[PDB]
């Protein structure tokens, strides 16, 4: 139901071994840890959640971009990249969060399919 | 020392009347409100802070993209766009945070000058 | 060796049935048709070429964005999106050209892997 | 009536000294040279044309990204970034073409005002 894909705009490659933390907003407006992992050699992170657990609500996907750039020896601007969105039940729908990283910039999009 | 510029990729226009909230991480690791404003007819937000008040720190620039799209009658994907960065850690700099918005995507970059 | 992936930033979806034309630069500096097709329901276009035919050289990938937006009833800015690059033999390497489309903007990146 | 702004996503700076060539499609369907210039210290290129000369037409704004990256000692992916659009077909407009550059990626948008 939820996949993350991360690309590197400097090297033209998947962004490999990037830590990704997913949080769900709780009733008291705090961010509860939900799922996490590291991107694969294809820049993808699968297996974060299941349809049973991924209920409607507000989610935050935090991509640890600073550590990624530092491990490449490159000085980055952002602490991390944060993608915050609402999951809404609207028929069967898979969410892909994609991010394209540069040292001082990033782009993110959602691919939501049935 | 801190300016925000927001563009609309659907209309090919400045993103006008976008609310922007800036936070600064406090010594107890909470986000403290630091400044806020709205983008002008040119999509720019000036006057958020002064060189005196804009000390070293970790800052979060929250661009209220959902309220922007909904005020135009559009249901967007993201709750907001969040830009988090350490500022002024090598002395005062001037920061422009630019964002380019679509209903399911956004790109952000920083222009940092001395 | 060469794949094209096209995403829609307005709808948060693959860009389906987008015409894509690939050209190779000829010795007289003209653009010779090389391969073409339409993106699938996943926004992907596979099978454009083979390793035997995809020799080093300058290539142009033209994505017919204007017709895509017009078929959705949306007025776009660009005539098409053009991605021009050199293919260089540098060990075994697959090229993915990705593009993320909005009516007045697009982003493109290359994912080049072994 | 036509301005070009170019930013560097690796350095977080204006892209300075970027060559830009503008073409206009002629009645015989060839690209005729129309104007050219280079971006300034602020990453902006002004003065390309006048309201009198900038008639209706299909225009191509070629941003010489490869020479930019190579002059900085970097081997980039794309030959250039090409922005192709019909202009002034509903009367004179002011066009800003903005581009945000990385070695393997770029994003471009247009700001069109009346
Ligand atoms: C973010 C982003 N993503 N993609 C692009 C092409 C952009 C930035 C565009 C921009 C930034 C500034 Br500052 C400007 O003054 C103007 Br005009 C345009
Ligand atoms: C271009 C561009 N600009 N901005 C972003 C976030 C993109 C690329 C998104 C992308 C690329 C590939 Br290949 C995928 O498989 C998937 Br899913 C998504
Ligand atoms: C996505 O672009 C992607 C990779 F980065 C690597 C692969 F082996 C396959 C892919 F689709
Ligand atoms: C900045 O790019 C900008 C706009 F987007 C719109 C305007 F009317 C004036 C500007 F400077
Ligand atoms: C890429 O994002 C993508 C689609 F658009 C659709 C799919 F079924 C699978 C994918 F990886
Ligand atoms: C435009 O954003 C801009 C730069 F990128 C750099 C400068 F020094 C001045 C500018 F207006």
Give me the DSSP letters along D47-78. -S--TTT--SEEEEEEE-HHHHHHHTT---SE
Assess contact for A74 and A56: CB atoms under 8 A: no
A9-18 CB burial, b ≥16 within 10 A, e <16: bbbbbbbbeb
Deposited resolution, Å: 1.5
Q: Which of B112, B96, B111 is nearest to B5 (CA)?
A: B96
Q: Which helix (H) or strand (E) holds C109?
A: strand C105-113
- Residue D69, phi then psi, degrees to nearest 5: -65, -40
Q: Which ligand ends up closest to the CA of C44?
A: 5
Residues of B in contact with D109 (CB under 8 A): 7, 9, 12, 100
The SS3 assignment for B29 reads coil
- Residue D88, phi then psi, degrees to nearest 5: 65, 25
Q: Which of D10, D104, D72 is nearest to C86 (CA)?
A: D104
Cβ-based neighbour number of residue A60 at 10 Å: 18
Strands C2-8 and C94-102, how do they pair? parallel
A40–B contact, CB cutoff 8 A: no
Q: Which helix (H) or strand (E) holds C71?
A: helix C65-71
Q: Specify the residue with its C-alpha closest to ligand 4, atom 6.
A: B42
Cβ-based neighbour number of residue A88 at 10 Å: 11
Burial grade of C86 (CB within 10 A; 0-12, 13-18, 19 or more): middle
Gyration radius from chain A CA atoms: 14
Assess contact for A91 and A114: CB atoms under 8 A: yes
- Closest CA in chain C for residue A114: C13
Q: Which of C74, C64, C85 is nearest to C21 (CA)?
A: C64
Assess contact for B82 and B44: CB atoms under 8 A: no
CA A36 distance to own-chain centroid: 9
Residue recorded with tokens 């979060």? B60
Nearby residues of A107 by Cβ (< 8 Å), 6 or more positions away: A99, A100, B105, B106, B107, B108, C100, C107, D107
- Experimentally, the structure was elucidated by X-ray
Is B13–D107 a contact, with Cβ atoms under 8 angstroms apart? Answer: no
User: What is d(CA C29, CA B25) in angstroms, rounded to the nearest whole number?
Assistant: 56
User: What is d(CA D84, CA C82) in angstroms, rounded to the nearest whole number?
Assistant: 8
User: What is d(CA B58, CA B24) in angstroms, rounded to the nearest whole number?
Assistant: 6
Cα angle for residues D25, D5, C24 (degrees, 5° grid): 45
Gyration radius from chain D CA atoms: 14
Max distance between CA atoms of chain C, in angstroms, equals 44
Of the candidates B78, B105, B109, the beta carbon closest to that of A84 is on: B78
Residue recorded with tokens 């990626």? D105
Which class would CATH give B2-113?
Answer: mainly beta
**DSSP class of C81:** E
Joined tokens for residue D7: 């930013």
User: For chain B, how are helix, strand and coil distributed in percent, rounded to 5?
Assistant: 5, 55, 40
Burial grade of A65 (CB within 10 A; 0-12, 13-18, 19 or more): buried
User: What is d(CA B15, CA B6) in angstroms, rounded to the nearest whole number?
Assistant: 5
Cβ-based neighbour number of residue C52 at 10 Å: 7
Domain boundaries, chain C: 2-113
Residue D15's Cβ-side half-sphere holds a number of Cα atoms within 13 Å equal to: 31
Tell me the β-bridge partners of B80.
A84
What number of helices (H) and strands (E) belong to chain D? 1, 9
User: What is d(CA C94, CA C83) in angstroms, rounded to the nearest whole number?
Assistant: 16
CA D96 distance to own-chain centroid: 9
Residues of D in contact with B14 (CB under 8 A): 111
DSSP letters of C31-68?
EEEEEEEE--TTSEE--S--TTT--SEEEEEEE-HHHH
The SS3 assignment for B67 reads helix
- C-alpha distances (whole Å) from B58 to each of A55, A91, B29, B88, C109 are 32, 40, 10, 9, 30
CA D40 distance to own-chain centroid: 13
Residue A17's Cβ-side half-sphere holds a number of Cα atoms within 13 Å equal to: 6
Q: Which of A9, A36, A31, A18 is nearest to A84 (CA)?
A: A31
Burial grade of D108 (CB within 10 A; 0-12, 13-18, 19 or more): buried
- C-alpha distances (whole Å) from C48 to each of B96, C22, C63, C111, D27 are 42, 8, 14, 16, 32
User: What is d(CA C56, CA C22) in angstroms, rounded to the nearest whole number?
Assistant: 14
The SS3 assignment for C111 reads strand
Residues of D in contact with C83 (CB under 8 A): 78
Residue recorded with tokens 């550059």? D101
Residue recorded with tokens 């540069």? A102
User: What is d(CA B18, CA B3) in angstroms, rounded to the nearest whole number?
Assistant: 13
User: What is d(CA C36, CA D21) in angstroms, rounded to the nearest whole number?
Assistant: 28
């Amino acid at each position: 139901p939820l996949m993350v894909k991360v690309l590197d705009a400097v090297r033209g490659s998947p962004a490999i071994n990037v830590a990704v933390h997913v949080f769900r907003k709780a009733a008291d407006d705090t961010w509860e840890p939900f799922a996490s992992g590291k991107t694969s050699e294809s820049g993808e992170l699968h297996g974060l959640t299941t349809e049973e657990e991924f209920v409607e609500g507000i989610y935050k996907v935090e991509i640890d971009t600073k550590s990624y750039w530092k491990a490449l020896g490159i000085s980055p601007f952002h602490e991390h990249a944060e993608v915050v969105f609402t999951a809404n039940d609207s028929g069967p729908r898979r969410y892909t969060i994609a991010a394209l990283l540069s040292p001082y910039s990033y782009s993110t999009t959602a691919v939501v399919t049935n």
